[PDB]
From a paper:
We could crystallize a nonasulfide linked Bet v 1 dimer. These crystals belong to an alternative space group (C2) and diffracted to a resolution of 1.17 Å. In this nonasulfide structure, the dimer axis coincides with the crystallographic 2-fold symmetry axis, with the central sulfur on a (crystallographically) special position. The packing resulted in one molecule per asymmetric unit. Although both the tetra- and nonasulfide linked dimers exploit the N-terminal strand β1, their quaternary arrangement differs considerably, as evident by the C-terminal helix. Most strikingly, the nonasulfide linker connected the distance of more than 12 Å between the cysteine Cα. As in the tetrasulfide dimer, alternative conformations of the linker could be detected. The linker must be compatible with transiently formed quaternary arrangements, which are conversely hyperstabilized by a compatible polysulfide linker. This reciprocal dependence is nicely illustrated by the crystal structures of the tetra- and nonasulfide-bridged Bet v 1 dimers.
Partly conflicting data on the allergenic significance of dimerization were reported for the birch pollen allergen Bet v 1, an outstandingly well characterized model system in immunology. It is the archetypical representative of the pathogenesis related protein family 10. Here, we report crystal structures of dimeric Bet v 1, revealing a noncanonical incorporation of cysteine at position 5 instead of genetically encoded tyrosine. Cysteine polysulfide bridging stabilized different dimeric assemblies, depending on the polysulfide linker length.
Author numbering:
A (entry chain A), B (entry chain A): 1 to 159
The structure:
């Protein structure tokens, strides 16, 4: 089955700067700015572009130990990043894959709006629990806010 | 049980104008701007302020025929509107009440960000299905976009 959650969130950071930090340097930044959520990000196969498999590990404390994600598409001009959760964490008997899309859109005032889609490819007739949809949304917002705070505290970073 | 969904959406309309149209004149506007979603809004008990019970009817076409909502709180200065879904529609054997909060926040550029909370008071140990959470979110966004389009098309309205 399929369940598609689209959300939007705003940031005071201009889109180009946010894309460089949140997307292009996230492997480096996330364990530094949000250690309570992400312990490490490592390359299993590939360079960071489309097809790359990453292992995202969570700190001692979580239900889930890690996930493996695959980079699907990166558009450096239009600030789009598409990736899939393909193993570990919520993937298992009820859920085959989560396909995600992030687009960072500039606002006239020099901030950004992030358009985020989380698409659950459920196994057979399985539902996705509302708590799972919420957990994914909250993780993304946690990471965004941590990166935003870091960027405000380090005014030259990613310029 | 309880399940709380917080979402945010942006509008190009300044907060004060949007509050006057979307909140303070919604009974009038919704059936006019979004007839495919709302057929009528009528007063069962009260004047439109806290404690008021409204009957919201849906057009021929829907699963649900109507809901009764109660106004909980209105802050005309800070652009807050809290209301509850108390009968009809999704209310029944699995769900006792939905308590909703809308806050319309001005942006420096003269637009708005709406902070919306949908809090499900489930009966006993019942879950809320992700499809239901999505349906509520989509209804609110449909109504917002319809009001926004109307306001852009009628530049003097609600000034």
């Amino acid at each position: 089955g399929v369940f598609n959650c689209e959300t939007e969130t705003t940031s005071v950071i201009p889109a180009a700067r946010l894309f460089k930090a949140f997307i292009l340097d996230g492997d480096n930044l996330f364990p530094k700015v949000a250690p309570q959520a992400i312990s490490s990000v490592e390359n299993i196969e590939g360079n960071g572009g489309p097809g790359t498999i990453k292992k995202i590990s969570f700190p001692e404390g979580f239900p889930f130990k890690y996930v493996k994600d695959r980079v699907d598409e990166v558009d450096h001009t239009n600030f789009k990043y598409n990736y899939s959760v393909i193993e570990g964490g919520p993937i298992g008997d009820t859920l085959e894959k989560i396909s995600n899309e992030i687009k960072i859109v500039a606002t006239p005032d020099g901030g950004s709006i992030l358009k985020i889609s989380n698409k659950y490819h459920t196994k057979g007739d399985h539902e996705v629990k509302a708590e799972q949809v919420k957990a994914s949304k909250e993780m993304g917002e946690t990471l965004l806010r941590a990166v935003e705070s870091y960027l405000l505290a380090h005014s030259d970073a990613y310029n």
